[PDB]
Design a protein around this ligand. Structure first.
Ligand SMILES: [Zn+2]
Ligand SMILES: [Zn+2]
Lengths: 86, 208, 93, 163, 208, 163, 86, 93
């Protein structure tokens, strides 16, 4: 139902499992509760957590699809966690 | 003077009633001059129950087939993933057009540009590199080919690949092939005013 | 028209979705399964004004446009520039 | 027989690519030898560290001012300036190398590469080189140009030498 | 040798996989070379509540107008007889296309050719003259303009004007105008494999 | 100042039209004077009664064999043949007049008119004339040509003279 | 109902008036029975008479419209009478 | 499916249209208003064989394809290579 995520500095999150299976690494770890990350920044983790709900909610509907707001500064290190997670 | 910067300012005549001579006719002339011997061309190989073309790229292939059916039209099936898809013969509404064959034109525009589209090397963009060699429309195609359709890698890379300049490809280009009929491209968004970020994020690559 | 809300305490955040017509009783039930506490020590706070149990989110000020998933709002809990800061113990075996 | 040269391009720090030029020496020894000597830099001064000061997109790219870096310079091994040469060679499409002079018999060290079928560049400049490998690099450099000739970024040459 | 008849036989390379090098690539090259500086061009004059063009012919005019409406298209109304007619924006079926706007393209093709289209002089073809100056597509247009739609003068004259040769006008021609969008010509019968006798006998001339 | 000439065309009997040529004499006196003398025919032999023996559609139209009428002839007022001239002039698109020679320094009386932007006609033939009026007539003549150069009908010159 | 036509050599024809009004000259003469022509050849008149019925019958229907058979030899003098009649 | 027929006598021709199912009685009525003669002196001839009044054109051999307006057939009358030749007087005042 609920899975646990740990950031680099200790930022700890709880995520619904339906959104949790979206990530390949999370799916692999759960298939093989509590998930720990070592180098993922807290702000980057907070930004990437919301994309799971954004994708799940708008998976079927394609009416407007508002643009995802990404700052130019944060996009450089967003891929840092995006590649590792997926 | 300082150099050879005369060109055709004196040789430009126009002035019939068009007016605004600078930056309008010169732009068209430069666009035509640049796109003469730049790019690849379509070529015909193999013939078994159908005419087949595969172009001359060497790195980003594209297979098209045309049967002998449609005795008065244009089927022009093309290979995507692992199946053949029909370009289209006639669409009742423009809405059915934009959304059913944009995948063909998007890959066709990129496959004609002459660029080093090998060694993607995902280790790029990792330590602060931008890969300035590729154009705006070429890096987008590379990202589409090498990324999952909706993961968080078509979005960050597109944001990191926004500073690249876009070259205007004229409508009379992407033509002059050996084929005497060719499909008609009723869509200018792919060649001018290029694709928005919201349309490259939901596109399936032909390559598997 | 789901409304997405956050409860950010100390360093962690809890994110959820509900309805504008939905009351705060189910919101309290959500944290019941997290803090494992009876519905007496928790009092929902909105901005700097006290929030009661008997008033739903429709007239509380929450709107789908202002509570979009791109930027969900935060309410917090109790036992801009600055907000509340408190403690939270982990679950015991 | 024909000497060849190589250039390494850098666009604002990180390198972009490598290009190779082939120099015609039998048809014209003077300007080919001058260009080779300037590129390899056996007299101290050389083409290393220069900057392409003007690019006309779809038209041409000029550079080779290692003294003033403003397009008003020019030097040669023979002297400050020399006179013209034979006009046997003619432009044959894109990617062709030719010296640029302000006036007749005023050839210094400002060369330029043309990436278009320009037929009116006849009787005014001497054409001596053609790109062997790296046409995509030439297009990448030229894509950063502008109508006025201003460059949005600094395109420089990092290394020079003879194969 | 006997003369300058070298051309580009040695300079022709092709041979990738196209084969049949003579009479196929040389024909296309000659067709492109001939149609560069031959013909007239569209020009823009006047501007009241709409963009108006009238081309530069001097003998066979053609007026076109485009309003500021159709915010995402192409109306492109043109004057025929004494009223404006819409070229078309979208047709459900190809049958509705061929039969509703062929009049525009038929007159557009002729109006671009550069020929002496004055002094019709109906006294010609009366004592055994053929008027070899005009092309096949130009004399047909002159007959259409100067004859009743279905009388016994569009038929005898067409029979007497069958020996004239036809020049192939490429599809990339009739373009390169100052207009950046232009209508799309989804009909090749007007430019190649020219109109049959049964279609020029039932066509109404734009001129009055 | 510059002399001009006029030609009348006839296609198998009935005439087709009239064309006017302008001859450059200041830039080259020899070939211009030879062409004018041959056209006006003050020495008996002239261009009257000749026939265009080869037409390449979209490319060119050659003629001027008044002796053999087979393309193997040639004559001039100076003599049987003469040598070349200056190559200052260059082809500038369609409707340009230039003498045709089988080999170098073998210019006789076989001229030709080009109706295309041919850039490779340089260094082999001397160009001296340009059509003033009657381009449509030139197109009408050239429309009867063929790839092999054979003419479906006989196109001849009915009258010649100087304005 | 029926109108009378006379050729050059005396070839005399009777034509239904509905087909007769098609020709402008015939209409003008009837408006202002019997119609005489001076230089119209007999064969040309016979050829041109059939076109009236061909046009009247196929005025509305446009299904096939078979081609009108005209010999190249006769077309030169067909216009001779076509211009005078119309 | 109109069938177009001709009656060519001496130098003149009479052209008309009828139906394949239509009999020859109306064809005789047509020439009644031309020759102004009773239906006794006229006998329709087809090729070289006698044609009777009681048989319609459907089985006589006339077909729309072979009697097209582009080339109508000819039957003639009485009182390839060659055909009949006779006399005809003009109408009297
Ligand atoms: Zn590219
Ligand atoms: Zn024409």
């Amino acid at each position: 139902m609920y899975v646990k995520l740990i950031s680099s500095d200790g930022h700890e999150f709880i995520v619904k499992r339906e959104h949790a299976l979206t990530s390949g690494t999370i799916k692999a770890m759960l298939s093989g509760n509590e998930v720990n990350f070592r180098e993922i920044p807290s702000h980057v983790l907070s930004k990437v957590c919301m994309y799971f709900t954004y994708k799940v909610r708008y998976t079927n509907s394609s009416t407007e699809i508002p643009e995802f707001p990404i700052a130019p500064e944060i996009a450089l290190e967003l891929l840092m966690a995006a590649n590792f997670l997926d | 003077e300082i150099g050879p910067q005369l060109p055709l300012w004196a040789w430009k005549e126009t002035a019939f009633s068009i007016n605004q001579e600078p930056y309008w006719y010169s732009t068209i002339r430069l666009q035509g001059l640049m796109w003469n011997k730049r790019g690849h061309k379509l070529m015909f190989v193999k013939e078994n129950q159908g005419y087949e073309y595969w172009e001359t790229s060497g790195k980003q292939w594209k297979m098209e087939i045309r049967r002998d059916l449609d005795l008065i039209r244009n089927a022009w099936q093309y290979k995507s993933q692992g199946e053949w898809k029909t370009i289209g013969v006639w669409y009742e509404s423009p809405g059915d057009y934009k959304g059913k064959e944009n995948q063909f034109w998007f890959h066709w525009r990129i496959a004609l540009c002459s660029c080093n589209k090998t060694r993607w090397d995902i280790r790029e963009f990792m330590i602060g590199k931008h890969r300035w060699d590729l154009c705006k429309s070429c890096i987008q195609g590379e990202i589409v080919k090498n990324t999952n359709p909706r993961s968080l890698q078509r979005l960050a890379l597109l944001h990191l690949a926004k500073d690249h300049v876009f070259q205007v490809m004229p409508l009379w280009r992407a033509r002059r092939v050996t084929v005497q009929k060719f499909p008609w491209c009723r869509s200018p968004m792919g060649y001018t005013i290029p694709w928005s970020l919201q349309e490259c994020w939901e596109m399936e690559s032909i390559f598997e | 028209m789901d409304v997405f809300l956050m409860i950010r305490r100390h360093k962690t955040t809890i994110f959820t979705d509900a309805k504008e017509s939905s009351t705060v009783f189910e919101l309290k039930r959500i944290v019941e399964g997290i803090l494992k506490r009876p519905p007496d020590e928790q009092r929902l706070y909105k901005d700097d004004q006290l929030l009661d149990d008997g008033k739903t989110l429709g007239e509380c000020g929450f709107t789908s446009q202002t509570a979009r998933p791109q930027a969900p709002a935060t309410v917090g809990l109790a036992f801009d520039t600055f907000e509340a800061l408190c403690i939270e113990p982990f679950s015991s075996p | 027989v024909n000497p060849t040269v190589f250039f390494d391009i850098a666009v604002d720090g990180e390198p972009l690519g490598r290009v190779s030029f082939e120099l015609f020496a039998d048809k014209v020894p003077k300007t080919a030898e001058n260009f080779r000597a300037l590129s390899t830099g056996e007299k101290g001064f050389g083409y290393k560290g220069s900057c392409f000061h003007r690019i006309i997109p779809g038209f041409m790219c000029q550079g080779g001012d290692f003294t003033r870096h403003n397009g008003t310079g020019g030097k040669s091994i023979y002297g400050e300036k020399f006179e013209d040469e034979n006009f046997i060679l003619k432009h044959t499409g894109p990617g062709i190398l030719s010296m640029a002079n302000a006036g007749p018999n005023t050839n210094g060290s400002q060369f330029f590469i043309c990436t278009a079928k320009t037929e009116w560049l006849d009787g005014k400049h001497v054409v001596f080189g053609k790109v062997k490998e790296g046409m995509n690099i030439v297009e990448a450099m030229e894509r950063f140009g502008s109508r006025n000739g201003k460059t949005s970024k600094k395109i420089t040459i990092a290394d020079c030498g003879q194969l």
